């Protein structure tokens, strides 16, 4: 394995990838890249089932205690999106406007996660082509002095290892990470749409059976 | 074509490098016509001119 | 002909690497669904839709004469759960855009489930060809490094190219072909569900029987 | 068959084979059984897996749509629909039925009966557009088989050239068996590229191009049926429907 | 011709030929019979198979759109569309007829004529948007011929290459002098790549660029004839329509 | 590196790329490339956080003092799109019409930035293929000297340099610039969409807390 | 569609390879040349 590290091949492939990504994005994107990885690799604490019972409780309250009672139930609730959603309904705002206020938070969260994945997907697009550049700079050197000058072997290496770094990094690191970010955005966005459908159903004062039947569509 | 074909950049790379090798090895060696003759007739029958 | 075309160290790089790339690429709860995915891919149709229509059609006739109170004869629980529940939303306490909304969420959920099955096979079928190249380049680095005689250079390189042949063939004969069949059966199952949504809403609108068969047969090949 | 396909295949043969024969080739030199088995057998396999059998059995209808000879009938049905609108402005709706009771266009016949039966205008479009989008989906389901075949075959080519290199590279020191072996690395490329780009992908494009023309005639008849229900005046009916014709 | 295409083709020829001469070479060695016949013959065959003959007969009009010099006087028609609104405001809609007896733009004429005849706003939008959709579809159908010519020509290059090698190696019978014979076989890849990327795909791009530039002027005229029906004030009319001008 | 530089391989790739964009677009588009780059490398001094305070202040002034007091404040504001927006609402124009007139301007700005990026996306699509052309014209010449493996190696080595310029320019210059134009376009369209919810909320007369809630969804 | 080039490049290179292999096939490699590259290669491979 000691023979798989090659200085010039790492500088061409990774230095090239870094250069292409730094040209491609504003600096305020790149400064957020840590949060991309921290989204990808956090454990599934998903508690959709726990919230589902809270919304059902609030529906049963809303039918009986009146809309003004809901505030006491959400007063210190841990889910901020649910808190804001319920509070807009206790404040008596109309259905097409509470829909419009809530959907903007979901759209912002969907855009924020896509902005993370695209930086990773782009790195996975450039690094393979830096492979080809590393290979061809290598071939130009090898064929340049083909007089068995004894330097052919060293340069043949760079031409191989630049391929290996370019392909392995793309298909084992950058592009695999990208898939997880996109797959885990689709957990959180779905849970937000469930909470929205919860808040609207509480405002319409649907019965517990209709509430549980609708919300179950977002769970598996 | 969709991203499924993204492996093509890489495949190209493999062959290109392999090409470096065989072309590299060819130059060092002159050709012995006898081998050249047998092949010319080995291929002649196959493509049937 | 089969002449020395099996090499272990080449299957281990390709399939081991593919599994590694897929396990990184998805949360664990996705991977545990692959048994269902492959069963949807290779599972008999035994389509009965030509029968579900007949039932949906007949139910309309009952509502037109017998009130919706007697539309509960579906409480026999037709095998299709979607129809049982759908008609239990046409039983009173409901209104047409709400009945549409609750039904259509089940369809949108089932479309998203089947796409999430197929995406694993599409991604597996993209990673496998690229690993083939890794197996080949790893082989060449080992050979060229320790070259003895010019005589054996030919045979050695050949046993090295098998990684590529395993990779590309696996993708275009197993992974990517299945991915297609999962998605092609999903678009046939969703189509039946959309037809029933046609049935359930129409009955509630109390449309004439003859029009019912014209709307429903539109979905039937 | 169809005139543009007939000219195309004749030009194709004179170009590819007729060029090679000028420079003194032989037709039997372009046949290699192992290369045909790898490329066409591999392609057929990937297709039979990737689609249900009830789709594979539809391919005759796909070809019959692609090479259907062209018809100018749209120019006739425009006059029929305008005449029916002329009747609707002036006459009892019974005439719209009995004027149509023998009509060859089934979609138009059914559509007119829906308005004479007095069904509501936003309900009529909800059954007519249902009948259209079923026809649109049928033609897409034909074309996807050829788009898939033309996607697999190139790669089976690369599963031929590499299975050709693995033979040649195995007999470097034997120039007596290199000759028949090296042929596979060429010919398997050639079948992979030629089948994709002269058969499968061209057929796929032509199915889709004929489908668009079928759907446009249906969309015109829909605007016909709805304008007869509105009782729109004949010159404006002519003006709307003429946008679907060239 | 369009000035950018004239500068472009001069640059294209000077770059390709100037490069080929500077590294040593003579032009008479770059022209080959069989390679041209396979690459262009095969491209024509693939396109003829891919489309009905009624499409292929429109190909001249594709070029006439692509290299049309940009007269378009949208800045002049804006003053007409604003002025016509003032005529409706001061003298009522019936005075509009006299302003548009003879206007060069038929789409404007038809639009205004529907408004003075007092058609409902959702109807005048519907009848006019059909014309824009028909123009957009017509120009897309021109461009796909050039896009598909551009996707076949490179692959015909490979087929012409491989058939070249097959003949040379086949009847090799040569004194280790194969360099010239092998070399010529690569001319087919040069014609396949050059024609695709200097003719077919560039022409396709320019068709689509000029189509969008024309559809914008139609969408402006639509907001022009809708605005005179609602009776907007002159400042708001001049504000709205300017958003369609660069 | 005096052996990595070339005359003819640069002329075939860059001259061929220029010939392919000049044929591929109208002349009036090509003269806009300076403005494309000037957007791509616009130094970030953005002040969305300042305009949000201005809009919130304007709302509560409208809700207290009556709409006509808005006229005084808008006159001096530097953002031209915001100025026109309030001027519509001071003119008392109907809400579905204010949305229509404002959204035409946003659509026009989105289309202008797409038209800037497409020149670089197409330049980076042609340049690799001009590399292949430059390569193949090299090989056609060289394969004539196959007899002597004395010069075949050195000759081929220089022939592949056209591939190197075609791939390096595409993946380190043209496609990265195209990405950055699109990235900085979206972060200007977002500011306009925020101004739109600003202007409409001033017209509806919603209270300051709700305005500050809605607008912040467009900010990071 | 920005990847058109690779699908043609591939073929071009490939065609060269298969030819060159055959070329080398009917040729003989002087051991001296092979050794300098093979011995130079192994040690430089970091062996």
Author numbering:
A (entry chain B), F (entry chain C): 27 to 246
B (entry chain G): 12 to 60
C (entry chain A): 26 to 246
D (entry chain E), E (entry chain D): 1 to 246
G (entry chain F): 14 to 60
Question: Which statements did the authors publish about this structure?
Answer:
Two types of membrane proteins, A and B subunits, form a stator complex.
In contrast to Class 2, neither a large cleft nor significant deformation was observed within the MotA1 ring. Despite high structural similarities to Class 1, three of the α1 TM helices of MotA1 (chains A, B, and C) were not observed. Based on the results from Class 2, it was expected that LMNG binding would cause significant distortions in the ring array of subunits, which would hinder visualization of the α1 TM helices. However, the structure of Class 3 suggests that the interaction between the α1 TM helix of a MotA1 subunit and the α2 TM helix of the neighboring subunit is not essential for ring formation, which would occur in a state of equilibrium between association and dissociation. Furthermore, the plug helix bound to opposing sides of the MotA1 ring, by crossing the linker to their connecting TM helices.
